[PDB]
Design a protein around this ligand. Structure first.
Ligand SMILES: Nc1ncnc2c1ncn2CCCCNS(=O)(=O)NC(=O)NCCCC[C@@H]1SC[C@@H]2NC(=O)N[C@@H]21
Length: 323
């Protein structure tokens, strides 16, 4: 309905108190009977709303669906983000973000319950199941040189890891430079892109995909053994709204660190949170592949690699597989 988001927002704003049907009706200038119809539909979509005679309605729990009216509250109180766009389905939040950033200096994020053309690094297919993951693109406006893209990627990794770690009883680790793992399971892939020229960055677009509630059966058999979800490591129901709130918190925290701190001030923290050490790694580099060991991460965020032949490498980025 036309007023479903408006009603949902009123319910959300008024927690933990009940709000009467009459008061919603007056707030939105619609009838009591249209308020009731909207609320029945919200409950049908899986909103847990307690309704009590003479008292009104209390929103108790939201379903695994993104609602614009709720997310609007997140951006209203955000010092970072001007707005969000929320979709049930699109080709890709990253395509959408890249179109929406043109011609303005707004900071914003784009969420979709489902992506039909999710793409990771090297245009690889990213599986984006409806109602099972956070598929999001974040657009930010750092006033910095284009070479700073690499350090942004390192800072944001730690924020995403921290947000996920709050909900996982199991160790969450970063694989440099672009993924998050729980044990052998990839729980998140992110990538950082930019629009830029020699005078500076016009926008950062960080595309973030986080598996929230997949069971193992919900991953294609080709990736099942290398994929996992937060829910598979959380004894409690993962609430996607609680999680998003924590994720935006950490993104903002790490973005402000990115603007103010050298990478050397988080380099040790990064190293202790990574899962690339003390193991043979497989590198892909255009048409050639080689094996090696990660020796160090230097003050600039470059990986120091000693390959199979004993030769050292210093890498701004790499395409790394475990085995
Ligand atoms: N759901 C899943 N979970 C675990 N594994 C899966 C999987 N789907 C496929 N695979 C195996 C294949 C991985 C190959 N990619 S990677 O090179 O290893 N790293 C990587 O791509 N990072 C960046 C990912 C960017 C996704 C976000 S989403 C929102 C935004 N909009 C969009 O379009 N992109 C971005």
């Amino acid at each position: 309905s036309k007023y479903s988001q408006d009603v949902l927002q009123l319910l959300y704003k008024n927690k933990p108190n009940y709000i009467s049907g009459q008061s919603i009706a007056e707030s939105l200038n619609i009838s009591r009977t249209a308020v009731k119809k909207v609320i029945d539909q919200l409950k049908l979509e899986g909103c847990k709303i307690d309704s009590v005679n003479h008292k009104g309605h209390l929103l108790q729990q939201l379903p695994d669906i993104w609602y614009q009216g709720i997310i609007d509250q997140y951006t209203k109180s955000s010092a970072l983000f001007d707005f969000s766009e929320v979709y049930d389905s699109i080709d890709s939040t990253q395509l959408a973000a890249k179109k929406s950033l043109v011609g303005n200096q707004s900071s914003f994020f784009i969420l979709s319950d489902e992506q039909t053309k999710g793409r990771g690094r090297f245009n690889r297919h990213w599986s984006s199941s409806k109602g099972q993951g956070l598929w999001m693109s974040v657009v930010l406006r750092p006033n910095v040189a284009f070479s700073m893209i690499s350090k942004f990627n390192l800072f944001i990794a730690l924020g995403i890891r921290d947000a996920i770690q709050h909900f996982s009883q199991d160790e969450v680790k970063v694989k440099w430079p672009n993924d998050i793992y729980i044990d052998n399971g990839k729980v998140c892939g992110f990538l950082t892109e930019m629009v830029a020229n020699n005078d500076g960055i016009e926008a950062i677009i960080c595309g973030i995909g986080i598996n929230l509630t997949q069971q193992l059966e919900n991953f294609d058999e080709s990736i099942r053994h290398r994929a996992t979800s937060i829910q598979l490591h959380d004894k409690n129901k993962l609430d996607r709204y609680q999680f998003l709130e924590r994720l935006l918190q950490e993104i903002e925290k790490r973005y402000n660190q990115f603007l103010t701190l050298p990478f050397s001030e988080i380099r040790e923290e990064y190293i202790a949170a990574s899962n690339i050490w003390n193991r043979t790694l497989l590198f892909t580099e255009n048409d050639k592949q080689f094996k090696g060991q990660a020796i160090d991460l230097d003050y600039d965020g470059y990986l120091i690699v000693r390959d199979e032949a004993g030769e050292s490498h210093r890498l701004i980025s790499a395409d790394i597989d475990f085995g």
